[PDB]
């Protein structure tokens, strides 16, 4: 299948409560495999998936050096952004960054990403060309000018087309029994009367991986987008995800409704109905 690697950085200031926290987590698809937290008793890069544990000390040391360096750099960046927005020293602020690479089903680079946000709003992003920037405002234009001056984009491109893909492929091989295994959803439809003449049909998908899934209800073969209550896909805590979609239907009309499930783990898409 297609696969991706992402690192997610959160740098958060907290005036009066010490220096800004820096936390980095790394993912392959929906599987976290590393963390680094500057607030840890002894901050170091820690494994969070069994298949990464085989990496040698050089790997962990390299990672930790990078994250420790970032802990410092991102603090300066937070100071800089505070100034770019003429903000007071009183408030907490957050830089977030997500970056990494996407592979297609042939294992080839589909595209790279490097995106940053400030206080939850898009700040600056590397364009798909891996060569130019999109800055959200005149503050981010200052960063852009700095990054253009320092040829940051060229270094991200080198990483994204090189190390990023190389390591992702390595992880996919090392963790192939899980990372390259799609677990299809276990499905059932439940029925709950909400009144004498309406009932809830809830279509459940449990135990699936990866998280991407499509769960819809149709009535007489027509999508019921507006009338469907769809919960956010949620982690079970055992690597798998859960989701449900519910419709309230007129009593007696239950068989006009079909739940449709699309998941990578499904060679054939499911059509389910309530089975009384």
């Amino acid at each position: 299948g297609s696969h991706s690697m992402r690192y997610f950085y959160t740098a958060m200031s907290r005036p009066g409560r010490g220096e800004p926290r820096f936390i980095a987590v790394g993912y392959v698809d929906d599987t976290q495999f590393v963390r680094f937290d500057s607030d840890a008793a002894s901050p170091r890069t820690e494994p969070r998936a069994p298949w990464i544990e085989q990496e040698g000390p050089e790997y962990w040391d390299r990672n930790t050096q990078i994250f420790k360096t970032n802990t410092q750099t991102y603090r300066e960046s937070l100071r800089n952004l505070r100034g770019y927005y003429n903000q007071s020293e009183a408030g907490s602020h957050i830089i977030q960054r997500m970056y990494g690479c996407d592979l297609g089903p042939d294992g080839r680079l589909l595209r790279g990403h490097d995106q940053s946000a400030y206080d939850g709003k898009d700040y600056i992003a590397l364009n798909e060309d891996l060569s130019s920037w999109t800055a959200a405002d005149t503050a981010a234009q200052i960063t852009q000018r700095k990054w253009e001056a320092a040829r940051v984009a060229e270094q991200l491109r080198a990483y994204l087309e090189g190390l990023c893909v190389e390591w992702l492929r390595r992880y996919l091989e090392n963790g192939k029994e899980t990372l390259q295994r799609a677990d299809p959803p276990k499905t059932h439809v439940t029925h709950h009367p909400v009144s004498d003449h309406e009932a809830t049909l809830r279509c459940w998908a449990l135990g699936f991986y990866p998280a991407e899934i499509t769960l819809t209800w149709q009535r007489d073969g027509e999508d019921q987008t507006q009338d469907t209550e769809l919960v956010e896909t949620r982690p079970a805590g055992d690597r798998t995800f859960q989701k449900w979609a519910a419709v309230v239907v007129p009593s007696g009309e239950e068989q006009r409704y079909t739940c449709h499930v699309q998941h990578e783990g499904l060679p054939k898409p499911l059509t389910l109905r309530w089975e009384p």
Partner: peptide, 11 residues
């Protein structure tokens, strides 16, 4: 594996 930044990677 993450990307190595420099000091000029500051925002």
């Amino acid at each position: 594996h993450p990307v190595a930044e420099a000091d000029y990677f500051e925002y």
